[PDB]
From a paper:
In some cases, when there is a short upstream open reading frame (uORF) that precedes the main ORF, ribosomes can translate the uORF, terminate translation, and then undergo a poorly understood process called “translation reinitiation” whereby they resume scanning for another AUG initiation codon and then translate the main ORF. We previously showed that two noncanonical initiation factors, density-regulated reinitiation and release factor (DENR) and multiple copies in T-cell lymphoma-1 (MCTS1), are involved in this process. The structure of MCTS1 contains a pseudouridine synthase and archaeosine transglycosylase (PUA) domain fold typically present in proteins that bind RNA. DENR contains an SUI1 domain, similar to eukaryotic initiation factor 1 (eIF1).
Numbering used by the authors:
A (entry chain B): 25 to 48
B (entry chain A): 1 to 181
Amino acid sequence: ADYPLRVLYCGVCSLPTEYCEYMP
Amino acid sequence: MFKKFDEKENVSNCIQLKTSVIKGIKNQLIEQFPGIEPWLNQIMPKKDPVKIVRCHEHIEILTVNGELLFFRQREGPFYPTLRLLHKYPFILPHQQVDKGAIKFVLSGANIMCPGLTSPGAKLYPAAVDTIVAIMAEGKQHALCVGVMKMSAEDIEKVNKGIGIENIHYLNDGLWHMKTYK
Ligand SMILES: [Zn+2]
């Protein structure tokens, strides 16, 4: 019931860590 | 819309908006995204100045405290940025592509109907021109803002062609511009 979500962004590729897989 | 975008070669300038114009833009955001209305005081606080970053090809990016909220081209519809969408995923209806399509949309490709009709994908009813959040099989966060080019019923039936236009995707030029400053 509480927003904004705070999504962790990877410090190297800058993506959500579930998309790291896709960034060399 | 941002595949070869970057601040240097695309951003002309950044105007701060007057109260007259801010109320009008908020109204258009309300009309476009009804469920955003209770959250606008939080996204665009009374206290904070509102700026438009003006970009080549008549692209505008709405910013508050240097955070990029929405963008449009011409006086077309507003689209949430992916960063705003990650904070408020409910702003947009969803479509879910199969995991195989992830690599292609992260390289800027449009979404083809097999990416939406194959196992692992989830297609939900949507009229053409609907602004949708693209989700990925097995992934919690959105990776693309899209526009339906065929309706979701057509996509099930025709099953070939561009189903969804890729407008903004993770690590495109807009994504890389984390703040304006
Ligand atoms: Zn990463």
